Subunit: 394 residues, 3 copies
């Protein structure tokens, strides 16, 4: 069929894909649109990227539904370690597989912009676009990569449904993946590392599914940021270095069965009246020194709750920070800060810390339940309006 392209064999390109794969992909998209021209004759296409090193100089703009862009793997190599190492004898010094080097010279910061102009009720949303098994690489960057090199890997900026980002590698980008106005996106089995932020669901979203990823962005941004987000599912992920899952007016999320590690506070922040979110069966680890920051002090919380009726159950909170590094100086660090809200619920969580640490209930909070989720020594209730069933202690 004529719906399958390989960027290196397609004879219609005016430029080499190794020199500018963005131009080649834009030219393929123009070809698709010249062939798929009515409401009922737009099934989409496959663009395959074989293993190779490809510069992108021109931003790709996608407004075609059901486009699959697929390569041979995530291609990750730690450019952070490379850039602190003597690499003269390294067999390879670049990320690989189907490797796009994001090197825009066109005035834009995105490698891929997924955007349709026009009101979605009138022209339709962008549907079931698939990015699979290739590598997006910002080439050069310094920690913590935000503002960094200012490069974005994939940015969806118009309303979309059932999009899919799977098996990809993202490295040395200020923003790996940004999806605005996402409905049922699937972000699964990716390897995102040494990036300023990993996943940002902006504007609003419904029922995003974020599963089975490595997310290893640094301390100036977010591993997962989601605003006006209903029904987020975050599970099966390994989120490292500076794990920061922030919901801003996010509700009815299910954040379960993840391995969560940060060298900084705010592993999960439920902000701006984020309510009825479940945090269950996660391992939380707070350590210190892989980078340092004063973005947060250690009273912010490993988990920070500003909202109602959230549920925190069955987790481990493991905290190991030398006392001399804890801020504000002389203060006990906070495991969970219930900053504001009503009827939040903490049950059956195990707190293991190298120094005395606390679940803090702000004086404004009401009806918080803390049930086998803190010994008496681990609870700092600044209001009598709470219910405590202590974890047994001496």
């Amino acid at each position: 069929a004529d719906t399958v392209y390989d960027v290196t064999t397609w004879a219609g390109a005016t430029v080499s894909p190794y020199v500018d794969i963005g131009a080649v992909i834009n030219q393929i998209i123009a070809d698709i649109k010249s062939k798929q021209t009515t409401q009922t004759t737009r099934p989409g296409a496959v663009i395959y990227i074989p293993p190779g090193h490809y510069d992108l100089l021109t931003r790709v703009v996608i407004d075609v539904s059901f486009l699959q862009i697929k390569g041979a793997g995530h291609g990750f190599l730690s450019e952070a370690i490379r850039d602190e190492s003597q690499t003269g004898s390294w067999v390879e010094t670049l990320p690989g597989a189907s490797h796009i080097r994001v090197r825009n010279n066109d005035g834009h910061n995105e490698a891929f912009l997924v955007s349709r102009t026009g009101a979605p009720a009138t022209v339709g949303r962008l549907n079931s676009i698939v990015f699979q098994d290739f590598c997006l690489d910002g080439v050069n960057a310094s920690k913590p990569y935000l503002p960094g090199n200012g490069k974005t890997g994939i940015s969806f900026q118009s309303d979309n449904d059932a999009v899919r980002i799977e098996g990809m590698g993202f490295v040395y980008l200020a923003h790996a993946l940004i999806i605005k106005g996402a409905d049922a996106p699937n972000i699964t089995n990716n390897f995102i590392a040494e990036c300023g932020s990993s996943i940002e669901l902006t504007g609003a979203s419904q029922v995003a599914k974020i599963t089975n990823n490595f997310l290893i962005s640094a301390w100036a941004g977010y591993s997962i940021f989601a605003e006006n987000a209903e029904g987020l599912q975050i599970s099966g992920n390994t989120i490292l270095w500076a794990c920061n899952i922030t919901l801003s007016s996010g509700n009815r999320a299910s954040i379960t069965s993840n391995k969560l590690l940060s060298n900084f506070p705010s592993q999960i922040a439920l902000l701006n009246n984020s309510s009825e979110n479940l945090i269950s069966a996660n391992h939380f680890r707070r350590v210190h020194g892989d980078g340092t920051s004063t973005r947060f002090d250690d009273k912010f919380g490993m988990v920070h709750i500003a909202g109602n009726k959230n549920t925190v159950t069955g987790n481990q909170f493991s905290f190991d920070v030398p006392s001399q590094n804890i801020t504000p100086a002389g203060q006990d660090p906070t495991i969970v800060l219930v900053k504001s809200g009503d009827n939040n619920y903490l049950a059956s969580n195990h707190i293991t810390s190298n120094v005395a640490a606390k679940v803090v209930l702000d004086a404004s909070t009401t009806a918080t339940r803390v049930l086998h989720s803190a010994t008496t020594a681990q609870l700092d209730a600044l209001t009598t309006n709470h219910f405590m069933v202590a974890t047994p202690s001496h």
Copy 2:
């Protein structure tokens, strides 16, 4: 090798795959069988479906193990929203990617029937058939799609081992996926929506794995139905609209780490003595109005338990139904109904509801434990044969 086919380039086809891809795939299967003729020379084959709109007029019958049918993606587009919208200016009005329009004219309701005749012990089971990354579409349908258009996407009707359905899209079918007699099936990373039922594991099954799917079937059928199911694993799924996981004599299931939402009761029903099942670390949301039904009333439960020794831990139960829409009118809706059985266990669950709501223990139940899983006001125990450690509510 000669084991790789593309439905649009294979020269042996006597009909266009755009006109009847079912006939073309059947012709490919006959070709495979003519070349793979002994029990040690049947490694199977791959059938690739490039992006395109393909009508299926003839049911495909698969009785070859290790067949892979693969496309370019799940191709979902909401035909339900289309059919309630003014679409004259929409860029697309059809689902896409590798898109099969299920339009049987052969008197059969399935697009794909996976079935071998004979006693499995004699002729062997069907093994490790792989459906990946294509779209099955019933073309036209009306809510709640059951009985609907009667169309079925994929139906396995003989005993099978290690089959795999991954990355697919299913839309506008009465039944997306039916697997009868499945051992260790893998149903993962699919997008099933606007179907009557999503996944039906019929007859019996052993250790089915249902992970990382979107399941968005409506209120007349099941998101997941499984009868005589041992050892189900259901995790990492987002199940929406009319979430209904029903086990019928299912035991030792692990139902964990799911996002579960319905506009109706019966998000999980453990029926017909379903025992020793774990329901842990799930978010349950009950809302109202995206469709309405009287299939269940609000006393049925968000979770309904008829069986022994089940375990319900670390969940959130969030309930928001306007009082005027609650039925029976005036009665408190039920969050968990323990309808029958012995030694069921609820612990460390949080119930948040817009009206007073209850965990109900039927009079027939024995030795139920309810431990930090209901305040006193949230428990309606109809037998003294229970143990309550209340979620605190009085200072």
Copy 3:
């Protein structure tokens, strides 16, 4: 591009891949190295294996980063059932899809060895090698497959980063997958069955992700073995037959949302001071008779803890072993043995057993918390240094 190979069409092969696919893959690797000759011109390559039966006689050695070896599916067929059945009329008697029959004639046990010589700081690690969707088959083996046929599927034996093993089938191997010195490996959506051990993370590892697999290895080995392992994440798996997850000096693991079943003790063993590991929202099932062994007695525990500050929450422990088969004879079997360590935490777990069974706290342990995770009759505390909040049992 010239970076995509098909083992059956590449004209540079001097041996048929059906006779020795190992030689052909080695020849492809040599070709890649001849074309990719500097540290900025080594993006890697794809090697595609179409459906077919391929003998491997020569061990493959991979020292190229970003190599993808991919086939058409996991290809599983139960050779264990085959070898106890009358198969004369079976349609197929071999595993299939992209089927590598591991038949080394070179005195090595590995089908695939992934190894670079030289210090990783000097020559680099092996990065992001991808094995996807093919079948590695040891051809003939007897239970429990260790020592068995001594065959290993894939073995990484030099330090590696972000490797990926996905969608594979492994069958009838002594060791399916071994990874030494793994940093952020991804082992996902595989089908490993009728092998001695499934996954072994040797030497040391950091943040391995083991998700969404069927792991069905037998009772002489390990489903998941990990030594000096920091930050393992094990979730969404169905682990069967002889589930055994053993950590040796492993810490900060997250073992959640799994379906876990064994006919033997030691479903999870946290050994040699394994600390701050989470075991949450898993279904544990212990049964008897699908093979028998005395490797462990029933006092070892379904979960065995030798370490500090571990967390066991929201699980079900379901135990069904006939009393006449329990060892030592006349003794109550152990559900969780806290063998050594401080401040371990058990909360909100449901224990269901056919005979009296116990959480046992060794006399050496300190500050164990058992909170709604055992009735009085289910706790055998051999030290007074513990905290008990009993699961209620008396009215």
